[PDB]
Design a protein around this ligand. Structure first.
Ligand SMILES: COCCn1ccc(Br)cc1=O
Ligand SMILES: [Cl-]
Length: 130
C-alpha cells in the first residue's frame, strides 16, 4: 500500500539522518569511505564484506533496509570488520578499534533515544509479510 511505502520512506529518512550524524563526527572519518585497495591492498583479502558509511547511504537510497535491525547489522559489520582487520596491541590498531566501538555504541544510543519501538515493530511486520 501507499501507507507501507510512506512507512519505509520515513525509515529511510530516519536512517539517513543517523548515518549523516555518524559521518560528520571526526572520530568516524576512517569509516566514511571504502578502503583504497592501493592504500591497503590486503584489505579485500582479509575482509570479505567491506562496509562503510558511504555504502550504508547507497543501500538506504537503493531501499535495501526495511528495518532498523537490518541497518544495525551493517553498522555491526563496520565495527566487527575494524576489530578483525586491526586486532594488534599497537596504538594505530587500538585507536581504530576504540573508534569502531564508539561508532557502534553511538548508532545504538541514537536509535535507543530516537527510534519509536512501535515504528520498528511496524517495519518488521511489513517486511515479514513480503
Ligand atoms: C570490543 O572490542 C574492544 C573495544 N575497545 C574498548 C576500549 C579500548 Br581503549 C579499545 C578497544 O578496542
Ligand atoms: Cl587520526
Amino acid at each position: 500500500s501507499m501507507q507501507e511505502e510512506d512507512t519505509f520512506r520515513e525509515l529511510r529518512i530516519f536512517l539517513r539522518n543517523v548515518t549523516h550524524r555518524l559521518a560528520i563526527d571526526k572520530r568516524f572519518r576512517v569509516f566514511t569511505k571504502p578502503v583504497d585497495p592501493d592504500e591497503v591492498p590486503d584489505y579485500v583479502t582479509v575482509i570479505k564484506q567491506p562496509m562503510d558509511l558511504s555504502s550504508v547511504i547507497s543501500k538506504i537510497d537503493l531501499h535495501k533496509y526495511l528495518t532498523v535491525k537490518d541497518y544495525l547489522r551493517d553498522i555491526d559489520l563496520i565495527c566487527s570488520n575494524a576489530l578483525e582487520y586491526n586486532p594488534d596491541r599497537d596504538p594505530g590498531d587500538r585507536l581504530i578499534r576504540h573508534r569502531a566501538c564508539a561508532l557502534r555504541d553511538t548508532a545504538y544510543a541514537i536509535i535507543k533515544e530516537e527510534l519509536d519501538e512501535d515504528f520498528e515493530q511496524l517495519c518488521e511486520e511489513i517486511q515479514e509479510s513480503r
